[PDB]
Specification:
By secondary structure, this protein is mainly α. Helix content is 30%, strand content 6%. Helix 1 crosses helix 2. The longest helix is centred in the first third of the chain and has 12 residues. It is classed as hydrolase.
């Protein structure tokens, strides 16, 4: 699924990401935009042979099993393909465990380079939330 901006903001809010570990809803929306373009099906290989999955580009190096990332962890206890669903539950719950692990949203390279220290409020402008 490719979400609309406000449609994704509403789903993320419903799922509790809103000010989760202090990150306002617009940070999450901005991260999704720059990670996946709001597309739940997005996949992208990393240089180390891991892959990033879904709307939040969750890495198989640590968080999920894709059957082709040797000596990696699966800390969300899920197949990475779960992260590609039209339903974002698995992605959001996994993201909660990622952001909570001590480095915050900096785990998301697109967030750190494109969203951090910007007016992320603009990502939820106009949305009925
Ligand atoms: Au403001």
């Amino acid at each position: 699924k490719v979400f609309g901006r406000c449609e994704l903001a509403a789903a993320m809010k419903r799922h509790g990401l809103d000010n989760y570990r202090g990150y306002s809803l617009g940070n999450w929306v901005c991260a999704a935009k720059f990670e996946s373009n709001f597309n739940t099906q997005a996949t992208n290989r990393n240089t180390d042979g891991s892959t990033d999955y879904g709307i939040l580009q969750i890495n198989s190096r640590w968080w999920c099993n894709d059957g082709r990332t040797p000596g990696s962890r699966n800390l969300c206890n899920i197949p990475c393909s779960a992260l590609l669903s039209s339903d974002i539950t698995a992605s959001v719950n996994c993201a909660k465990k990622i952001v909570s692990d001590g480095n915050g949203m900096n785990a998301w390279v697109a967030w750190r380079n494109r969203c951090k220290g910007t007016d992320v409020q603009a990502w939820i402008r106009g949305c009925r939330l």
